[PDB]
Amino acid sequence: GSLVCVGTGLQLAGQISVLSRSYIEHADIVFSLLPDGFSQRWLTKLNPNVINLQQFYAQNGEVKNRRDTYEQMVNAILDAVRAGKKTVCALYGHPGVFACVSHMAITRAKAEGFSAKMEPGISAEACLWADLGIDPGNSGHQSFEASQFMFFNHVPDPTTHLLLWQIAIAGEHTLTQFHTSSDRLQILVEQLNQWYPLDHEVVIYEAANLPIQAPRIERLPLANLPQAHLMPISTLLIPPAKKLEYNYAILAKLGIGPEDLG
Amino acid sequence: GSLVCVGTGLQLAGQISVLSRSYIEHADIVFSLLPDGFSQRWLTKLNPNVINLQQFYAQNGEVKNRRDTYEQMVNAILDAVRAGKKTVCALYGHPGVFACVSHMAITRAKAEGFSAKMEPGISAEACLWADLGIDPGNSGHQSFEASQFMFFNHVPDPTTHLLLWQIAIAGEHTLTQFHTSSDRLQILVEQLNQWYPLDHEVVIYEAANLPIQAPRIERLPLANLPQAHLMPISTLLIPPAKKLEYNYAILAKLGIGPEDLG
Amino acid sequence: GLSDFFTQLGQDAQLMEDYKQNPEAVMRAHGLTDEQINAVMTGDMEKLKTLSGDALVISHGNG
Amino acid sequence: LSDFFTQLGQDAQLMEDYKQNPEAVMRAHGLTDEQINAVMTGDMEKLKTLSGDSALVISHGNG
Ligand SMILES: Nc1ncnc2c1ncn2[C@@H]1O[C@H](CSCC[C@H](N)C(=O)O)[C@@H](O)[C@H]1O
Ligand SMILES: Nc1ncnc2c1ncn2[C@@H]1O[C@H](CSCC[C@H](N)C(=O)O)[C@@H](O)[C@H]1O
């Protein structure tokens, strides 16, 4: 048995890598976690032997810590591998971006002496740059999980493009809710007010999952975030607050200056 | 005429999206910028009408600003579009990740009232996460163009995974050289020494371009960077210098404590 | 019908470009109903799923 | 070489076969000993020389 974790991307059918598609096709069994049913149908046509990981999420207003959900997911995957099945894990976007299941599975599979690897996919971040036409290298890029950015000590560079993932559950500490409250978002706003003004234009982005669907690019002042309509698949883009200031200290050591910049 | 910029990923043939491949196939003309001649042959067999953008780079130890190169690249692409050709731009990895050609071509295309979009691809970043089994959401992620980090004021978060792109030309201010020098990289070390010890393990990462090629994952102390063998395709990974510490300030506002974390 | 169309559209750059030119024409040619087309034009994803039949968090920030 | 690498890169079946027994698969596709050696030694440069096909930089940071 072996494990290959692949990404399908965000778009239906067309945004998966050629090789990653081939893995699914020739897989003995596929553990899937896809955005919608259209994507689920597509997969089933590629490979009929599919197990939906979705089933491990809380069912019926049940109080369940996601850490247990993820653990149950990993176990299910490994069970297939241990049985001797050429197992493929198919997660939406990139299987290793803000996704622990794949990393955990591969880690555990290796520890048990099984072949396991991860194939890169197109993440929601990749889609963002293209849709908004922003180059992360232009002035640099930062990504944080929204709740981690509140619970732990993170200092952002206000000259870069900042991404706060899982903004929908920002400040949800129990890991048993699938959305947060406006009050939690207000605290985050207040925290961001250290580097970013209240009238600073932010962007709520949502990559399209369907080829006939247009992406969500909602621009609004940071202050209005708490009243905004957020969904699980919502990513918060916080553009630069300042421009790039020169670093004379280093330039001097380099023995150059602004006028010498090509 | 129309423009569609696509990524071919890093790996040969199999790391391109299903849709992006389709675009190349049905394109009237293709402008290419691929890593090697294996990828060049692959493209040629997919669509014979290919113009390689590689030609616009400095030829024969010539002194040429890359600003001009990219300009000539953009102009060559637009000429096709203005001609009326259904044009596709096939860049390696992700077309809009640390790449100004596409964004510049798309922007100019729209300005001239042409249809132009960008399809996301798999970038060297996406590969890194998969090869090193690192989740950017684990402790956070930051990306910076090496030289920009030296020339301008950037403050990294030592708790996050930090990527420095184009480390091979870090400090190359003329934009005429293809590589920097050890003395430049030495100054980078001193700069990084503000947040990272000299004995801090960094990783020189190079994603493979061939399916028989293993990736480059060289671990070494930050101090030995200046003596390290760097290539244009080399990315510098700087793991967290510090672990996540609770943000009591925000926790208090949330009216919770560390032990309340799910 | 609806599912097969979306699947093909998302994979075929030829059909995709055809769709861009004339969404309704392409959709009607693939036998999409008026209500299905309206949903697409108004971008009501919800309805699209209802007309077809029938969580995405895979991480946390608690360390 | 070029024909083999393109296939290998696209075909997951062939890929899994390769990782099972690299030399076996390479010999099966008619790669020379030197070519195989180059692969095992990880000498990409020689692979190119043997394929006859002897700037990835598309960005700056000077503002
Ligand atoms: N369609 C979409 N558009 C925008 N952001 C999305 C998205 N789907 C997921 N996300 C972001 O990703 C988070 C889930 S974590 C999983 C992300 C996925 N592996 C990827 O590669 O993108 C969401 O909370 C949101 O911040
Ligand atoms: N094969 C490879 N492995 C690792 N990093 C690479 C790489 N090819 C390019 N890079 C990185 O990308 C920089 C060039 S900018 C072009 C990046 C490309 N659009 C992408 O999607 O990755 C290099 O200086 C290096 O930092």
From TrEMBL, chains A, B:
Annotated Tetrapyrrole methylase domain residues: 3-213
SUPFAM superfamilies associated with the record: Tetrapyrrole methylase
Keyword annotations from UniProtKB, A to Z: Metal-binding, S-adenosyl-L-methionine, Zinc
Residues involved in S-adenosyl-L-methionine binding: H94, A124, Q166, A207, P232, T235
Residues noted as binding S-adenosyl-L-homocysteine in the record, renumbered to the chain: H94, A124, Q166, A207, P232, S234, T235
GO molecular function annotation: metal ion binding; methyltransferase activity
InterPro entries hit by this protein: 4pyrrol_Mease (IPR000878), 4pyrrol_Methylase_sf (IPR035996), 4pyrrole_Mease_sub1 (IPR014777)
Keyword Aminoacyl-tRNA synthetase included in the entry's annotation: no
Gene3D superfamilies attached to this UniProt entry: Cobalt-precorrin-4 Transmethylase, Domain 1
Family annotation (CDD domains): OphMA_like (cd19916)
Residues involved in Zn(2+) binding: E125, H141
Keyword Chloroplast among UniProt keywords: no
Protein name: TP-methylase family protein
Organism field: Shewanella oneidensis (strain ATCC 700550 / JCM 31522 / CIP 106686 / LMG 19005 / NCIMB 14063 / MR-1)
UniProtKB/TrEMBL annotation, chain D:
Pfam families: LigA
Organism this protein belongs to: Shewanella oneidensis (strain ATCC 700550 / JCM 31522 / CIP 106686 / LMG 19005 / NCIMB 14063 / MR-1)
InterPro entries hit by this protein: LigA_sf, Xdiol_dOase_LigA
Top-level taxon of origin: Bacteria
Extradiol ring-cleavage dioxygenase LigAB LigA subunit domain boundaries: 2-50
Protein name per Swiss-Prot or TrEMBL: Extradiol ring-cleavage dioxygenase LigAB LigA subunit domain-containing protein
